[PDB]
């Protein structure tokens, strides 16, 4: 979590987002509304399932090996076989622990990156028509923020016909 979004300026998550992983939520004149962002959610699912295809399955076939349980005491060969098996088990346990920790850290960093990417994409779409309040929300200044000129935050925000900086963006009380 290095981008500081999921535990940063977003104070808490949203229980009830049952369709997507990242989304938009608003309260304009036409009432409250929520939508999910398919692109960032799909990218996160794509990378996590790439990890899942790397890990789940792909098991090497080991048919004949050495004896790993001994019912008697022999000496040199018994000690060597036990040492080899213990070395292999310790090395693979370290590999498993390091892989799990590194991939969990990368998953959390990827989630933080996707949240910050969606936030910055919305900020660059809005330009000077909105101010970031630091809660992850965007105070949008013109009219009809996400009902009729705000379903177009799929990539088609005009941000020119609603250059309303005189209302409250640059105004004196």
């Amino acid at each position, epitope marked *: 979590g290095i981008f500081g979004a999921i535990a940063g300026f977003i104070e808490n998550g949203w229980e*009830g*987002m049952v369709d997507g992983w990242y989304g938009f*939520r608003h309260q304009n004149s036409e009432g409250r509304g*929520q939508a999910a962002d398919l692109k960032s959610t799909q990218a996160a699912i794509d990378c996590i399932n790439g990890k899942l295809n790397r890990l789940i399955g792909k098991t090497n076939e080991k048919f004949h090996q050495i004896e790993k349980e001994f019912s008697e005491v022999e000496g040199r060969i018994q000690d060597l076989e036990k040492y080899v098996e213990d070395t292999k088990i310790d090395l693979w346990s370290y590999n498993a622990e390091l892989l799990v920790a590194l991939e969990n850290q990368h998953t959390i960093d990827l989630t933080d990156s996707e949240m910050n990417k969606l936030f910055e994409k919305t900020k660059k779409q809005l330009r000077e028509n909105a101010e970031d309040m630091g809660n992850g929300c965007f105070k949008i200044y013109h009219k009809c923020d996400n009902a009729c000129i705000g379903s177009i935050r799929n990539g088609t925000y005009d941000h020119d016909v609603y250059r309303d900086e005189a209302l409250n963006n640059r105004f004196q009380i």
Partner: antibody
Amino acid sequence: QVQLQQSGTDLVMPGASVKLSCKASGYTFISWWIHWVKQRPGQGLEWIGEIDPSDSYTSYNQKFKGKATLTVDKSSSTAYMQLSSLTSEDSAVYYCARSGYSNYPFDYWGQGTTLPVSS
Amino acid sequence: DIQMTQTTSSLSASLGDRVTISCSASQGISNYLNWYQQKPDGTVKLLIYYTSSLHSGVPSRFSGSGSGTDYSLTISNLEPEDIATYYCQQSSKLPWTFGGGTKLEIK
């Protein structure tokens, strides 16, 4: 599991006021919205209004505007819906539903409270 | 207000038949039609949240499809436990409006 406990049957005189209840259990009451649907025996389902338990956000249907008022109790995890000036047309089964947000589908429904408005 | 229409108010279908329930909208609701199942005792349950997305606990027999103004709900393996009234609801423009319903019957 998620349950929405509702009253069974309330006998209310016509022209009076009733305050239905819908106890919520098995989930966090604040983070999920509560709706209200009225179903007549001779009509279909009719959405009345919605409430946000976090800050008591109200937005009702245009037909049921002065008829219903939606309130919540975060301490007891119960959502109320007060009916005013009950007539013969208000005698129907009322359902409370948990959706997730305003425009999200109703996940779990209550048992339904039959309200016979008769003398 | 957008009017939800369901012409097949009463439909008759026997066991093992693929019954299709269609709900038509006045205008495009943009993939925002929900499906509800009201059992005759009075219990209402959500089956397909939006279109082609099954709710949790819903069996694989129920399925949904459609886009624009025409949406359909398919029950490929209809059983006695699947005999109930079926409703359609939008989630586009306040107010949220439900359909007339569709009650399944044994022929």
